[PDB]
Amino acid sequence: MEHNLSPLQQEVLDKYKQLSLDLKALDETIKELNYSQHRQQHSQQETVSPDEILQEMRDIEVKIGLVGTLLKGSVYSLILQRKQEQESLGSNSK
Amino acid sequence: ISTTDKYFIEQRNIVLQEINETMNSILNGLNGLNISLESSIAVGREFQSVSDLWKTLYDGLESLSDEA
């Protein structure tokens, strides 16, 4: 039977329908951001994923040590050898 | 409660159940996504040190601001 809700009630009914729709749209957008099918499905873009995260950042990390940390390690090794030579000289004196 | 009113209640409750489960899904997905970004921040935090301590080659605009 045709359900004679109040006209205000009917309007707010269409409004909840609209809210359901754009909530589904937002869900679809968030999924698209979280899709793992970047360039696997028909597409050419990328999504936030290991392609951009640790699998991509560890790619940078395993090589960045060559310029940044190994350089400091070199002079630290020099300083270690120097204090070793110093304590050897002290032992020779003592 | 009128039959029209009652039907509106049960329809309303059904769509509340749908909204509740869909919000639960959205919350879980966003939790995972933000955790992934937190992991990205954690792995990248170590790059600031090398950036600042390597600046001494050439900075340009920062050197200009120092010189301005």
């Binding site: 350089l71 400091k72 002079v75 630290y76 020099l78 300083i79 | 301590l53 001494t56 080659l57």
Partner: peptide, 21 residues
């Protein structure tokens, strides 16, 4: 040798800035 140590001073100042040598 002075020209040696002069030409490589940019490396020296880099290594000093981060190693506090």
């Amino acid at each position: 040798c002075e020209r040696i140590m002069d030409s490589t001073e940019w490396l020296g100042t880099m290594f000093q800035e981060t190693g506090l040598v």
